[PDB]
Write a protein that binds this ligand. Structure first.
Ligand code: NA
Ligand code: NA
Ligand code: NA
Ligand code: NA
Lengths: 282, 282, 282, 282
């Protein structure tokens, strides 16, 4: 098979808040537009399976693949129980791609497990893009744990490299999404006052503006070299393992295409958020 | 009503692994016996509700109370889903204690929300002690978010202080559990070969030994003063807000009782674990 | 009196190495010519006294001013004593400007001491610019301790604010130099082979490029807001107190003039170096 | 020749302040007593040369040995110029030991330079012990740069290992002093009011109390394993390279003798200070 689309996308809970009646209604319409645009490009390019690097799925040991056959349930947020509760979803899985991913990524030396368990539910980083892109179940979905507490960014790079080798063996077109953040120093509890549209630290705002310029200028050797420090000093969501998996799949320091910005970087509860297409190398 | 028991307890997933057939069967027998002993004292002291400060429940904004009327479901770990899956549980809740907690804690100036929502499920740091102590539904349970990413430890202190005032207004006896860790520098993914019974860093091993000595010697003024640095430099599970909520309920720097070590400190996947009773001030 | 010139300047030891016969002769010619250019503008503006914020002078308590009447001695580096040794110097001092500085800065509530002591010698961050600008003793010199181990950047801001008041009372024209670095993560001892013209970390290189862009675009409110994080995460030389003293004198977040880059940013032993004029507000 | 004594010693400026008339007179008498006791033991053991690991001598590149033939001068503090100024000293050097040290330490792979330069003056970490121990010039002195900004603690270990091989080739008895601190989080500038006899952070006080117990219990494998973290999280004076050089010479994780406490650990301007003899292995 073939990788046909790669993207970095936001999954902030304010996207669901934007759908609700209230003074926040429409506050994330541009972020939702970005998802729906990326979904349309996946339809245009005959994507049959989407792999999400989910920076909301926390793991301490190894890389985990949710390649469940079928995902059906009711989601309630443990962050915002009152507002995001009893949310229905139903999507088709791809156990076959999941097993190919396990086999090829395990050949790189990466510790990796594939799970086809009815009771292992999709995490939030995967449910959000699926809400806006896949309500008609046009796409199969496979999820990867990207909130990695005790892991090497070089192993997430290798996870992405092995993923390409899995796609080569799979009979279909695949899209990959890093579902997470730029900087993720969430706004302090004693500063709720300031609302959802500010950075906690000007520092994170400025580093995020520089990083977005690096993406637009295809400075990927330089970005890949500085990613450990960006992930540490800018409090990356899940340690920016989602960003590492995506760059791994694309060629790491050999990746050479300017990012196409879909949703310009915006603050959300003190964190940096963007939607961007990473064009494929020739 | 009355606070009658306070404890720091482990919830490591190796407790469930200890139950399973294999080379690790019985690897956490003494941790499980410590949970059972603490439960039995709860029975002896005519406890009707347990409040658990759950360091596995991640929140970014405010302190959240799960005071659902009824808890029933099937638990699958997203950390070790091959081993911890399809785990049945059913417990009774205490919405009345929950709303009192919200009333009294909000008067401290702390941001606090109480949830009585069917679909808001118990988190792992609450499920583990309920599994060993509460299978016969002797106790009502309330859960508090103690994985607090953007929160002051002085607000966790105030949460505990407000909780005492809520218990005073409640018609019955209450126990509180900080469900979490000492140091929580989880073992590196590339060091899986070392197994489950080691510390990641000798540094964490030695700081944890000093902290347990301080607890045993009632050095609570000194321990409270050093808690922000301990949480940072020894990678506390959820920032050690669970520890801060418990010490807040007990009197913070005026707490003067020697900790009773129910289960001696042990390493678990690189992290420090203990079961300890915190005797109440006369 | 009048502040007539402000600058950020490099004092790297490779400037002296550039003068010596060997394979590195001329390796810092442009940095030296930047010093000479800034010196000539001081001559043109009728500067009688230069105040240097010396990021090589380490202090643990309070801000110290060397306002000695006369400076004469022989300098041997304790960093590169094989190459920088027996270096003769002689300059005139300004005890009157020093006492005005102590008077006005103490009114801000900052802890400040002024020293007029024969045996208190000029530090390296002052000797280097005086070597290239002041060999004919055209200028009196005063030095300020800007390697501040335990100090608030808001107090370095207040030091600069007070200095403007001292200059207003002084009968003459004054120039101020922040003598120090951008990033100062010095190259690791085991990486000696890579030589003198590289950054230790791509991270430092890229943050430094963003910071120079901010300076060129007069984004001073943003730069001032991010300075505490920059100094911490990019290992600022002396904590970037030199930069803070200079921006304090210039108006801090109200400073609105684009920096004039006299010598483009260059790596030196892993660290970021620049010569820049900070034009004065009308 | 033979190593006959090893010690960790303080060099705090408050030792000189203790000698002066004022409310602080005698405030460091016990620290001075410790120096003079260690001096007397060096006389009793027929020491002819003292090597000091000087955590006040800052270097960015390589390890430097001050093995000048003769040291004579007047010292003025740039930390406290009013109180510590025009301090006379005169001591005999040992260029022969210095050259052996360079030869043997360079065989371990460590980058090391020996300097015999009249104008390269003794640093403060060396002048303080020499003031209290060597006013009659009974001992020759060699100084080593131990404020190492960019260096491996394993390289400081190898410097100590190589030093023993140098002493074996030298015709005399040698003593080694690590001249530095335990924790060195100097008291914040805005907390001057608290005086010189407090810790900045209870955290540093407690870690220092644990470390001193480890020394007294000969827990050297454990202490050596945690030293990188101690040096980082407790703000070690010069990064605790002085401590690593000493433990290097003594056997690192194979060292097995309980430290003899000469001056019990005491706070000085927020930092931890101790005088201790490290008995030689049989
Ligand atoms: Na948000
Ligand atoms: Na475990
Ligand atoms: Na240099
Ligand atoms: Na002192």
């Amino acid at each position: 098979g073939k990788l046909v689309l790669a993207a970095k996308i936001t999954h902030v809970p304010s996207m669901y808040l934007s759908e609700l009646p209230g003074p926040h209604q429409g506050c994330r319409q541009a972020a939702i537009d970005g998802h729906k645009e990326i979904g349309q490009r996946c339809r245009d390019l005959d994507v049959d399976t989407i792999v999400v690097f989910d920076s909301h799925w926390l793991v301490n040991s190894a890389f985990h693949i949710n390649c469940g056959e079928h995902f059906k349930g009711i989601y309630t947020s443990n962050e915002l129980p009152h507002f995001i509760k009893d949310m229905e979803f139903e999507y088709d899985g791809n156990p076959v791609l999941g097993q190919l991913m396990q086999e090829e990524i395990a050949k790189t030396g990466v510790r990796v497990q594939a799970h086809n368990i009815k009771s292992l539910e999709l995490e939030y980083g995967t449910l959000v893009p699926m809400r806006y892109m896949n309500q008609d179940r046009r796409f199969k979905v496979v999820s990867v744990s990207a909130f990695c507490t005790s892991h090497s960014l070089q192993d997430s790079r290798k996870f992405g490299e092995g993923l390409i080798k899995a796609i080569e063996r799979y009979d279909g077109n695949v899209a990959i999404f890093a579902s997470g953040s730029l900087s993720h120093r969430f706004i302090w509890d004693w500063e709720a006052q300031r609302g959802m549209d500010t950075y906690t630290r000007e520092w994170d705002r400025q580093v995020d503006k520089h990083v977005v310029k690096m993406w637009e200028n295809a400075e990927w050797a330089e970005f890949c070299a500085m990613l450990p420090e960006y992930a540490e000093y800018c409090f990356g969501e899940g340690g920016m393992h989602d960003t590492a998996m995506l760059l791994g799949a694309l060629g790491w320091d050999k990746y050479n295409q300017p990012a196409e910005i879909i949703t310009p970087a915006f603050p959300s509860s003190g964190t940096g958020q963007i939607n961007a297409i990473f064009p494929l190398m020739p």
